[PDB]
């Protein structure tokens, strides 16, 4: 697998789609 790919959402081309749960999951981790 590619190393450079980030861990939050799926990547298609240059567009990175983040589901609404994942941005909530980061806000849960901060709190």
């Amino acid at each position: 697998r590619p190393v450079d790919l980030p861990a939050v959402g799926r990547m298609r081309g240059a567009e990175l789609r983040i589901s609404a749960k994942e941005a909530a999951a980061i806000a849960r981790e901060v709190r």
């Binding site: 980030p6 240059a14 567009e15 983040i18 609404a20």
Partner: protein, 126 residues
């Protein structure tokens, strides 16, 4: 059709950085693209670009960057969230930058921590 002309531009930049070309022809121009490349040029990942008119952008690139990307839903982010967002988007905290559309403009996360302002995550490069 991808209305995200920023994503079409960044797809062209990623194709050139993979294919080893030394310039592109970003055919639909904008102003958010120009600000994005202004940040990339501040951090030295792109040599020199010009906006010519019919317009389009000619972007001399150094061969230093790895990946460009846009965050498509453009989530809002505070500073205490910004640290975790940086360390979850970048492979390392000292490599690459996250782009923010703040109330002070469009800038990187280090300039956002300098100027003490939060905002929406729009894109990233490394």
């Amino acid at each position: 059709v991808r209305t995200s002309v920023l994503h079409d531009a960044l797809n062209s930049i990623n194709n050139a950085e993979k294919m080893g070309k030394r310039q592109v022809m970003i055919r639909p121009s904008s102003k958010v693209i120009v600000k994005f490349l202004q940040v990339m040029q501040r951090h030295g990942y792109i040599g020199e670009f010009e906006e010519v008119d019919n317009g389009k952008i000619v972007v001399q690139l150094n061969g230093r960057l790895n990946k460009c990307g846009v965050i498509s839903p453009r989530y809002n982010v505070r500073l205490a969230e910004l640290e975790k967002w940086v360390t979850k988007l970048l492979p390392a905290r000292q490599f690459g930058y996250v782009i923010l559309t703040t109330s002070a403009g469009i800038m990187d996360h280090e300039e956002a921590r300098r100027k003490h302002v939060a905002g929406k995550i729009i894109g990233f490069f490394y």
